[PDB]
């Protein structure tokens with residue numbers, strides 16, 4: 001029974017509007033409706049992993065699990081195993097996997113973050129799940145961010161609090177937030193970003209949706225514009241949106257957008273918007289292909305339509321050699337030449353690097369770099385040829401070229417990370433000096449760059 005080198009992952013997000021679902025929701029799991037939809041010829045082919053994010057979910061965990069499992073069983077004739085379920089208030093995440101994956105899945109973690117203070121603490125935040133699938137780390141975040149067209153900045157703040165404080169993945173990766181802990185990170189939910197057009201244009205927007213002409217609406221989508229200006233979701237991907245706005249519908253039809261201000265909305269307009277989104281971030285040069293991104297047309301219990309996305313994701317096997325794990329493989333080494341960090345910091349402390357990777361027995365601390373002044377004001381931390389020689393646990397190129405090195409640049413004075421990034425070992429050549437590069441972030445904001453050259457020795 002060979003170990004897979006690819007799996008498919010289903011991501012669903014649905015704001016249920018506090019209403020029970022209808023008797024049939026199979027169209028969601030089948031990626032049928034509007035947008036980038038899944039071919040009919042695939043309908044009986046189960047995805048390997050289904051990750052379901054709900055918001056405003058009125059069901060017990062038990063009630064929702066029964067509906068999900070019975071749905072998937074009707075589609076696939078497979079009884080899925082529950083990997084994890086975690087609920088914060090009415091925000092929920094369920095992970096289901098094919099039974100053949102039960103002994104490939106380990107290190108299951110769940111967590112939640114509550115966003116806001118006093119007034120704004122009590123219903124918004126995020127839930128998450130992480131686990132290992134053989135040699136590949138997978139993270140999943142379902143967030144319900146702040147509502148309202150005039151609160152995009154609050155949403156961006158909610159995003160930063162979630163990525164700082166959601167405690168998933170390998171706790172030994174202490175300098176790294178969730179945006180660096182996983183081979184593949186999926187972040188989805190009711191992100192609540194709106195189409196920022198004047199209220200007086202509501203009927204014009206509706207007209208445009210009826211014509212399936214989304215271009216002039218997407219150009220005002222706050223998530224796209226905030227992402228363009230690097231205000232949120234830096235270094236994440238999203239598939240092109242080719243489905244109608246998923247909010248705000250009249251219930252029991254999809255024929256009408258309910259946008260006008262009402263006591264029930266706090267006298268706020270809800271212009272048709274793409275509130276319900278799926279984004280991802282994978283390590284550099286790992287296979288990840290979005291194969292569907294759309295909304296259902298036939299599930300109408302909520303004022304939101306369900307959104308689906310599916311992905312092909314590269315995975316690796318749990319590698320064992322005669323040597324590692326449990327020792328080094330002297331035939332393997334990673335060297336760094338001519339490396340330097342460029343930091344935006346106004347501070348003058350010494351800096352050192354930490355190299356973290358599952359290809360190492362434990363993380364490696366460098367010597368302090370040499371600070372110089374850049375031409376345009378910047379701090380440049382020079383490591384020259386001073387960086388240590390990293391000793392991987394396994395030298396087989398079929399293993400080592402699939403690995404990644406996480407880098408943190410830390411203050412000597414405070415031992416606090418000023419920036420985090422990631423370098424792929426999927427090189428064009430071994431035993432050859434080759435350029436490397438990663439942006440550096442801290443709390444998911446750009447703080448600098450790390451660049452230099454790498455020389456990788458494998459057993460071949």
Ligand SMILES: CN(CCO)S(=O)(=O)c1ccc(N)cc1
Pocket residue numbers: 026027030032033040043298
């Ligand atoms: C129309 N629907 C069935 C009855 O509602 S469906 O769930 O949207 C659907 C199912 C399978 C395919 N191939 C296409 C659409």
